[PDB]
Design a protein around this ligand. Structure first.
Ligand SMILES: *C(=O)[C@@H](NC(=O)Cc1ccccc1)[C@@H]1N[C@@H](C(=O)O)C(C)(C)S1
Length: 635
């Protein structure tokens, strides 16, 4: 019995070394090479495990139901069930039998080929055949392709069919002038270390018609991942990259020949899109005749993913940002369908996944506007659009009278002298300011005074009814929106600034569209949704129907009134309720904002923004095109 326990220890240390990929330490625990002991020596065991387990990408060896007894004086029989993960799936229910050995004062394992796999004997071999799974597509709400695998015209040059000297450079000048390429890059590709005189050295991919081919140029059709909208959805969709040996170590069920998602939805939906590798893991005769099959199943291609994104709206929302820093979110506010999640500036996902130069990748990573950032998922201070939330809270708790008219003189104000020199500032000097006037001219002092009158406790009671701190059920990495840094402002100055959306507030464009959906659902909050088939989740009684019926008419005037901050949108001639905003970010860096939706049918809602805006630039100047599209197609 005392020796049976030391034997149970060696069986667990043997399977642990196998589980850790240390096939050598497990080899040093076997017996000496003999007839009834170990069939092979140490270096031969290390190679047989490294060859076989390495070929099948065996990982995560775990055992259960250990039964260790005693046969005679020095040999202890031991058995157990075991399971492991391979590149073809999970090998479960493995009956491992064997004998131990307890000569001297320690216990070794009488190694046998049946310890690699159960039914192995002698010089049996292991075979593995695999068939790659085609990656599934990503499609918009109407079936248009967003991420697909298809045929690509790959332009490349062969050094021999190019020339000997003078004619070689003339063809390089022709290929660099016929496909919009660099003359220093064609000679930099044909002079790498892997190049041979007769090798097809690839260059770029022609995304259109193929011009005349100079001497040395040739087109080889190959299959790869393609993104139709390209950079217009690069942050959302993402890109796939070549699977490395480290990926296979983490998840053996990947296809080391295939691609893996590196960012965006391509990474978030990698398991659903990549499918399952098919094939057969068999044991063969000493000559190669198939003996016993361990795993086998057909290749199952990846499943498609249908998004709520509108492909035509996604391209228009992105193009309207003119390559400047910003982002736009468009929703159907009654259901939450995310029609567009544009972010600018962007990167080329096709060039990123079809072979990207090391120089271009550095430009993408050092660009100060940071193209890789998903700005629709980045938290910002909302600015003056947040006055709709503050006003609705004051209407709900009976602090705001819509017809009550505050008297504000000048462009600066402070509660009392204890504020030192900080003063709430407004842009328009209007003496008589009610709720309708304050929303039209975007008056901070009205918002600040009415926030302080309301107080912090009544303010947060209305704020807590929203989604501050919640994690949205979305396949997008994102931090939850926050009211402030702590659970209490502990400052009337910070309380006032939060009133008009310039405190420690952090709300990303997607969360803003979720919070502002109350004005399209009679005060019900409708959570945003990215997968088309998913159910519509809502949140009743966030603000009162009284406040919605009061603010939305005023938001119509933010567009229609001659002095409204969004009056340029009245040129569209469409029903619009909107609210602009310009957030100060502490030189003076400003973020332009625009909220807008159709108050007649609630068919669409839009939240656009510019980050670190240039002068006389705004989200309002760029919304005319996207608003015209959403008005015609989403009613
Ligand atoms: C809301 O964002 C308000 N802006 C401020 O309180 C700070 C500010 C920023 C830039 C210039 C002046 C003041 C108001 N809303 C914006 C807007 O709706 O675009 C205004 C420029 C009207 S100030």
């Amino acid at each position: 019995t005392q020796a049976v326990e030391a034997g149970e220890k060696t069986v667990e240390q043997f399977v642990q070394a196998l589980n850790k990929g240390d096939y050598n330490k497990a080899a040093e625990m076997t017996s000496k090479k003999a007839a009834n002991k170990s069939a092979l020596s140490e270096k031969e065991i290390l190679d047989k495990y490294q060859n076989i387990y390495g070929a099948a990408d065996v990982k995560g060896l775990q055992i259960s139901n250990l039964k260790v007894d005693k046969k005679d004086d020095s040999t202890y029989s031991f058995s157990y069930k075991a399971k492991m993960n391979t590149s073809l799936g999970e090998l479960k229910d493995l009956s491992y039998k064997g004998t131990l050995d307890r000569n001297d004062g320690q216990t070794t394992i009488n190694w046998q080929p049946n310890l690699v796999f159960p039914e192995m004997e002698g010089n049996d071999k292991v075979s593995l055949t695999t068939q790659e799974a085609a990656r599934g597509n990503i499609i918009d709400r109407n079936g248009e392709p967003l991420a697909t695998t298809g045929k690509l015209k790959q332009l490349g040059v062969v050094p021999s069919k190019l020339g000997d000297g003078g004619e070689k450079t003339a063809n390089i000048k022709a290929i660099a002038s016929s496909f919009d390429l660099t003359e220093d890059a064609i000679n930099q590709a044909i002079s790498q270390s892997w190049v041979q005189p007769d090798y097809f050295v690839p260059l770029k991919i022609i995304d259109g018609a193929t011009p005349e081919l100079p001497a040395g140029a040739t087109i080889q059709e190959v299959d790869g991942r393609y993104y139709p909208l390209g950079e217009a959805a690069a942050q959302l969709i993402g890109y796939v990259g070549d699977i490395t040996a480290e990926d296979i170590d983490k998840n053996p069920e990947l296809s080391s020949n295939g691609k893996i998602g590196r960012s965006g939805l391509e990474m978030a939906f990698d398991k659903d899109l990549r499918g399952t590798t098919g094939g057969k893991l068999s044991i063969t005769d000493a000559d190669g005749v198939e003996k016993k099959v361990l795993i086998e199943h057909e290749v199952q291609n990846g499943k498609d993913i249908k998004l709520t994104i509108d492909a035509k709206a996604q391209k228009t929302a992105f193009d309207s940002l003119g390559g400047k820093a910003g982002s736009t979110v468009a929703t159907t506010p009654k259901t939450g369908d995310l029609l567009a999640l544009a972010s600018s500036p962007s990167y080329d996902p096709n060039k990123m996944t079809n072979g990207i130069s090391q120089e271009d990748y550095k430009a993408y990573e050092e660009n100060p506007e940071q193209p890789f950032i998903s700005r629709f998922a980045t938290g910002y201070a909302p600015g003056s659009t947040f006055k709709m939330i503050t006003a609705a809270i004051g209407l709900d708790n009976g602090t705001i009278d819509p017809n009550e008219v505050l008297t504000i003189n000048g462009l600066k104000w402070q509660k009392d002298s204890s504020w030192g020199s900080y003063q709430v500032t407004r842009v328009s000097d209007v003496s008589q300011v009610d709720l309708k006037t304050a929303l039209i001219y975007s008056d901070n002092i009205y918002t600040a005074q009415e926030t302080l009158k309301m107080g912090e406790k009544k303010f947060r009671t209305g704020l807590d009814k929203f989604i501050f701190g919640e994690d949205l059920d979305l396949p997008i990495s994102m931090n939850p929106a926050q009211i402030s840094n702590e659970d209490s402002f502990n400052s009337d100055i910070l309380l006032a600034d939060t009133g008009y959306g310039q405190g420690e507030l952090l709300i990303n464009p997607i969360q803003q569209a979720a919070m502002y959906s109350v004005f399209a659902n009679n005060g019900t909050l409708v959570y945003p949704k990215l997968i088309a088939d998913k159910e519509t989740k809502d949140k009743k009684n966030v603000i009162g129907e009284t406040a919605v019926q009061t603010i939305v008419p005023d938001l119509r005037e933010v567009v229609q009134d001659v002095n409204g901050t969004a009056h340029s949108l009245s040129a569209l001639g469409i029903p619009l309720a909107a609210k602009t905003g310009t957030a100060e970010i502490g030189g003076g860096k400003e973020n332009s904002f625009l909220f807008a939706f159709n108050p007649d049918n609630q068919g669409y809602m839009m939240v656009s923004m510019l980050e670190n805006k240039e002068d006389d630039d705004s989200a309002t100047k760029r919304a005319s095109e996207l608003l015209q599209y959403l008005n015609q197609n989403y009613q």
